[PDB]
Scaffold this active site. Structure first.
Site: not given
Ligand SMILES: *[C@@H]1O[C@H](CO)[C@@H](O[C@@H]2O[C@H](CO)[C@@H](O[C@@H]3O[C@H](CO[C@H]4O[C@H](CO)[C@@H](O)[C@H](O)[C@@H]4O)[C@@H](O)[C@H](O[C@H]4O[C@H](CO[C@@H]5O[C@H](CO)[C@@H](O)[C@H](O)[C@@H]5O)[C@@H](O)[C@H](O)[C@@H]4O)[C@@H]3O)[C@H](O)[C@H]2NC(C)=O)[C@H](O)[C@H]1NC(C)=O
Ligand SMILES: *[C@@H]1O[C@H](CO)[C@@H](O)[C@H](O)[C@H]1NC(C)=O
Ligand SMILES: *[C@@H]1O[C@H](CO)[C@@H](O)[C@H](O)[C@H]1NC(C)=O
Ligand SMILES: [Zn+2]
Length: 598
Positions: A321, A351-352, A355, A481, A491
Site C-alpha cells: 500500500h 499524490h505521494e 506528502h 486502512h 480522505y
C-alpha cells in the site's frame, strides 16, 4: 514567577522538540524496515522501539504539568504545550500498549500476506492483492471470476482478523478514555480542532449526495446493458464486484463500459505510457518536475537513494500500500510504492509526492508542528497536482494523449471519468469512519458488527457484496486502512478541500475564469505556475503551527471548508446527467440490500 517561567518554558520546548524529532527518527526507521520487509524479527524491533518512545512520551506528558502553560502569554507556546499533552495510545499502561502494538502488527501483516488461488488453476496459489487480484478486479468482465476473487480476498483479509480487530477496538477505546476523550472517534476528530466538524461534513455531504445518486443510477443502467438483468437489477443496490475496484471506492476502471459518449474519446494513457517505455523512475522524475515547475522544492538525494519505487522481486513479504515517510531530520524523506506503469499510478505518484513536498516545506518547524494543518490537508496536496495531470491539456503537452478533440461530448466523457473517482468516493470515505466511530463509541453490539458495515455501505453508496454475507464473516478489515488503523476521514476532507485549492491555484495561474469558455476549471493545468507554487509555499510551510483555517487563509484568503468548489467543477456534468437520466427514464435510488443476513 510567570514571566520568568515562560522564558524557561520556551527553552524547555526548544530542546524537547529536537529530542522528540531524533527519537521519532529512530522509531520511523524501524517501522520502515518492517513495512519494507515483513519478518518476525523486524516486527519485534519496531514494537520494542515504539514501546520505548511511548514510555518517554509518558514522562513528557507528566513534565508538562510542572509548567503553568495555560497561564502563558504566547499563543504559540501554549499551542506546543497542548500538543505535547496529547499522548494518544502512549497513555496506555505499558503492558496494554505492548498488546495493542502486537494486535496492530497481527492485522497489518495478515493484510500484507494475503494470497489466493488462481480462479482457473487451484494449484497456482501465490496471487497477491497487488498486483494480481487488483488486475483481475480492474480488467475482468467475467462476473463469476470477479465474484470468486472478491470472496477469496474478503475471507482472508477480513474475516481472519475478527478477534484481533475486536481487541484493537477495546484498547483503542481504553486509550481514548485515558486521554479523556469519549472514544477513539473523538480522539480522531480532535485533529480537526473544530467541535462542529462532523455537522459540517454532513451538510456538505447532503449537498453533493443528489449528484452521487444521479451517477449511481446512470452507472447501474449502463451495467444492466452490459451484464444483463440477471446480474444487475434496476431497483436494487449495485453488485460491488462489477465496479472495477475491490472496495468499490472509485469506479474509473469501468469507464469504458459506462462512458456517456462511447464513440467519442475517453482518456486512458496507460497503453501510451507502456509504448513510450515509461518506468517507475521516470514517473517519479516527472512528478518531481511538476513540483519544481511550480517553484516548489526538488526532491533531495536521500529520496532517490532510499525510496522503494517498485515491488521487490526477491519473494519477501512487504506492505505494498503506497505510502510517504518523513524521517524527521533534514531531507530524509522517502516513498514506498509498488509502482505500475498506468494512468491511475501516475496519479498516485503525484499524490505521494504531495506528502513529500509537505514534509520538505515544514521541516524547519518545531517537531510538534511537523505535520499537516489537518490530516485532510496532507492528503489534498498531491491530488491538486493530479487533477491537473489528468486534464487533456496536460496529457497532450507530455505526449501521452494523441489526436484528441475536445468537443462537448469528449468534455462530458472526461467530467464523468473524473466523477467516477471524485464524487463516487465521497460516500465511501464517509462510511469507513462512520463505521469505525460507531464501534468506538459502543453504538453497535458485537453480534451486529458485520451487518452494521454492509448497512452503511448500502445506505450511503448503494452497493452490496456479490454473495450473501453474515455475522460469520467480518468484512471491514479487508480494506487496508481498517486493518492498518489509519483514520479515513482525512480522505473525505481532502476530496472536498482539494477542489478549493485547485480552483484557487487555477485562478492564480490564469487557467480558470468562470466567464471564459476557453478557461474551464476542468481543463486547468497549473504545471509551470509559480503563482500557484507560491500559495502552496505560504500554506505548507506553516505545518500545524496554526489552526487549519489560518492555513487555508494563507493559501487563498478563505477560512471555511466548503463544497462550493467541487460543485462548481462538476456543474456541467450535473446539468447534462440530470437530463440524460430523464431522457432515458433511469431509475434513481435503491431498495435495502438482502446480502447481509443478521
Ligand atoms: C482526565 O480527567 C481526570 C479526572 O476525571 C484527571 O485526573 C485528575 O487529575 C487531577 C489533576 O492532576 C488530579 O488532581 C490532584 O488530586 C490530588 C488528590 O487526589 C486524590 O483524591 C482523588 C479524589 O478525592 C482520587 O481520585 C485520586 O486518585 C487521589 O488519590 C491532589 O493532591 C492534587 O493536588 C496537588 O496539585 C494541585 C494542582 O496544582 C496545579 O498546578 C499548580 C502547581 O504549582 C497550582 O498552583 C495550580 O493552582 C494547580 O492547582 C495543587 O493545588 C495542590 O497544592 C497539590 O500540589 C491534585 O488536585 C486528580 O486526582 C485526578 N482525579 C482523578 C479522579 O483521577 C486526569 O488528569 C485527566 N487526564 C488528562 C490526560 O487530562
Ligand atoms: C529482511 O529482514 C531480515 C530480518 O528478519 C533480514 O535477515 C533480511 O536480510 C532482510 N531482507 C531484505 C530484502 O532486506
Ligand atoms: C521562487 O521561490 C523563491 C523562494 O520561495 C522566491 O523568492 C522567488 O521569488 C520565486 N521565483 C519565482 C519563479 O517566482
Ligand atoms: Zn496520502
Amino acid at each position: 514567577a510567570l514571566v520568568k517561567e515562560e522564558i524557561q518554558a520556551k527553552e524547555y520546548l526548544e530542546n524537547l522538540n529536537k529530542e522528540l524529532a531524533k527519537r521519532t527518527n529512530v522509531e520511523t526507521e524501524a517501522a520502515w524496515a518492517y513495512g519494507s520487509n515483513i519478518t518476525d524479527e523486524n516486527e519485534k524491533k519496531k514494537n520494542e522501539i515504539s514501546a520505548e518512545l511511548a514510555k518517554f512520551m509518558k514522562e513528557v506528558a507528566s513534565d508538562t504539568t510542572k509548567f503553568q502553560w495555560r497561564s502563558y502569554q504566547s499563543e504559540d507556546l501554549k499551542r506546543q504545550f497542548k500538543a505535547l499533552t496529547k499522548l494518544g495510545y502512549a497513555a496506555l499502561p505499558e503492558d496494554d500498549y505492548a498488546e495493542l502494538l502486537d494486535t496492530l502488527s497481527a492485522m497489518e501483516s495478515n493484510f500484507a500476506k494475503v494470497k489466493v488461488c488462481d480462479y482457473k488453476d487451484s494449484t497456482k496459489c501465490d496471487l497477491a492483492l497487488d498486483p494480481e487480484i487488483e488486475e483481475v478486479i480492474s480488467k475482468s468482465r467475467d462476473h463469476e471470476e470477479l465474484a470468486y476473487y472478491w470472496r477469496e480476498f474478503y475471507d482472508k483479509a477480513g474475516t481472519a482478523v475478527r478477534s484481533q480487530f475486536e481487541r484493537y477496538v477495546e484498547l483503542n477505546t481504553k486509550a481514548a478514555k485515558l486521554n479523556n476523550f469519549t472514544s477513539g472517534a473523538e480522539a480522531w476528530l480532535d485533529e480537526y480542532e473544530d467541535d462542529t466538524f462532523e455537522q459540517q461534513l454532513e451538510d456538505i455531504f447532503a449537498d453533493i449526495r443528489p449528484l452521487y445518486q444521479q451517477i449511481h443510477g446512470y452507472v447501474r443502467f449502463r451495467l444492466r446493458k452490459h451484464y444483463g438483468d440477471a446480474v444487475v437489477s434496476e431497483t436494487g443496490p449495485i453488485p460491488m464486484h462489477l465496479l472495477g475496484n475491490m472496495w468499490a471506492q472509485q469506479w474509473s476502471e469501468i469507464a469504458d463500459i459506462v462512458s456517456p459518449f462511447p464513440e467519442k474519446p475517453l482518456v486512458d494513457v496507460s497503453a501510451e505510457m507502456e509504448k513510450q517505455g515509461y518506468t517507475p523512475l521516470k514517473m517519479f522524475q516527472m512528478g518531481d518536475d511538476f513540483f519544481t515547475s511550480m517553484n516548489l522544492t526538488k526532491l533531495p538525494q536521500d529520496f532517490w537513494d532510499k525510496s522503494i519505487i517498485e515491488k521487490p522481486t526477491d519473494g519477501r513479504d512487504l506492505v505494498c500500500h503506497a505510502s510517504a515517510w518523513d524521517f524527521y531530520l533534514i531531507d530524509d524523506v522517502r516513498i514506498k510504492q509498488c509502482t505500475r506503469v498506468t494512468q491511475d499510478q501516475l496519479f498516485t505518484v503525484h499524490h505521494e509526492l504531495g506528502h513529500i513536498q509537505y514534509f520538505l516545506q515544514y521541516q524547519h518547524q518545531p517537531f510538534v508542528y511537523r505535520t499537516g494543518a489537518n490530516p485532510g490537508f496532507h492528503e489534498a496536496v498531491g491530488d491538486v497536482l493530479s487533477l491537473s495531470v489528468s486534464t487533456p491539456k496536460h496529457l497532450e503537452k507530455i505526449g501521452l494523449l494523441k489526436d484528441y478533440v475536445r468537443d462537448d461530448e469528449a468534455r462530458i466523457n472526461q467530467l464523468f471519468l473524473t466523477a467516477l473517482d471524485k464524487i463516487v468516493f465521497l460516500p465511501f470515505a464517509f462510511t469507513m469512519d462512520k463505521y469505525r466511530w460507531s464501534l468506538f463509541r459502543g453504538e453497535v453490539d458485537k453480534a451486529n458488527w458485520n451487518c452494521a458495515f454492509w448497512k452503511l455501505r448500502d445506505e450511503y453508496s448503494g452497493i452490496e457484496p456479490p454473495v450473501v454475507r453474515s455475522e460469520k464473516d467480518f468484512d471491514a478489515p479487508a480494506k487496508y486502512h481498517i486493518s492498518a488503523d489509519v483514520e479515513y476521514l482525512r480522505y473525505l476532507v481532502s476530496f472536498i478541500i482539494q477542489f478549493q485549492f485547485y480552483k484557487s491555484a487555477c485562478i492564480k495561474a490564469g487557467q480558470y475564469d468562470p466567464d471564459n469558455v476557453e478557461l474551464p476549471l476542468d481543463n486547468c493545468d497549473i504545471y509551470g505556475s509559480a503563482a500557484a507554487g507560491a500559495a502552496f509555499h505560504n500554506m505548507l510551510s506553516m505545518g500545524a503551527s496554526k489552526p487549519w483555517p489560518d492555513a487555508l487563509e494563507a493559501f487563498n484568503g478563505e477560512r471555511i471548508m466548503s463544497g462550493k468548489a467541487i460543485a462548481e467543477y462538476f456543474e456541467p456534468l450535473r446539468v447534462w446527467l440530470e437530463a440524460e437520466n430523464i431522457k432515458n427514464n433511469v431509475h434513481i435510488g435503491w431498495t435495502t440490500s438482502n446480502k447481509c443476513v443478521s
